Write a protein that binds this ligand. Structure first.
Ligand SMILES: Cc1cccc(O)c1
Ligand SMILES: Cc1cccc(O)c1
Ligand SMILES: Cc1cccc(O)c1
Ligand SMILES: [Cl-]
Ligand SMILES: [Cl-]
Ligand SMILES: [Zn+2]
Ligand SMILES: [Zn+2]
Lengths: 29, 21, 29, 21, 21, 29, 29, 29, 29, 21, 21, 21
């Protein structure tokens, strides 16, 4: 599960950057 | 969702931008 | 400004960890 | 919002949980 | 230690808090 | 070994957050 | 304050890399 | 490919730290 | 100073993501 | 350089692309 | 401590090694 | 390059310093 947890940390960093002022929801499924 | 899509395969900044608000 | 962008980066990483499976929302100012 | 509240002062993990889904 | 425990399996914030001072 | 090195980087970030003012020792075994 | 929290985050990541197998201690002020 | 993308993010962080004022080029091959 | 070191860390992570396969150059001031 | 330009003000992703190879 | 020393000024990697175990 | 070298095997801070300018 750890691999997925690690990946997700980078995902959210990337959305933070890409979404900018729009913001985002993070909903892992 | 995003974990399925982008942790099984790289997503570009354009693919990521779908998950934005 | 930049300082806020920097702060935000760390808040999303902290929300990622805190909120776990619930996921989170990030809405900047 | 979370920036006003947590970039101007430091937020506990408890306070951060307010922004969890 | 922590690498054995938490890199073979996810640890929550409560499990991590054992390694604190 | 790289997987472990990557995991450990996130571990310490997480302890930083969770331990707060208490601080921590990082001793990988 | 926040700036210190931010600084600290980066110091632990740098101690993680610098110190390698020795590991490190992080004690905030 | 994701593993490699994740690794690379830490690589660049590490070069940032190690290279200091010298700077660096990041050219993944 | 420190604030610049901090800023730089986040710029390299953002260049890593933005620039993708092209890679990037980071030259501090 | 990129620090002058992007640490004193916030850079778009477009502006950051100037420092891509 | 390391915050006083390294958040008020920038620490070399050599200086950081002082806080290694 | 660096991905081949250091993502298949750990590189120390000295091995990384080769890729610097
Ligand atoms: C930016 C990024 C992070 C993690 C996984 C991806 O597919 C993309
Ligand atoms: C927070 C965190 C990071 C890395 C591994 C874990 O199991 C937990
Ligand atoms: C510092 C570091 C990061 C990623 C991979 C390595 O081999 C080394
Ligand atoms: Cl990772
Ligand atoms: Cl920062
Ligand atoms: Zn990682
Ligand atoms: Zn930061």
């Amino acid at each position: 599960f750890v691999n997925q947890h690690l990946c997700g940390s980078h995902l959210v960093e990337a959305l933070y950057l890409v979404c900018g002022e729009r913001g985002f929801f993070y909903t892992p499924k | 969702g995003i974990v399925e899509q982008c942790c099984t395969s790289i997503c570009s900044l354009y693919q990521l931008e779908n998950y934005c608000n």
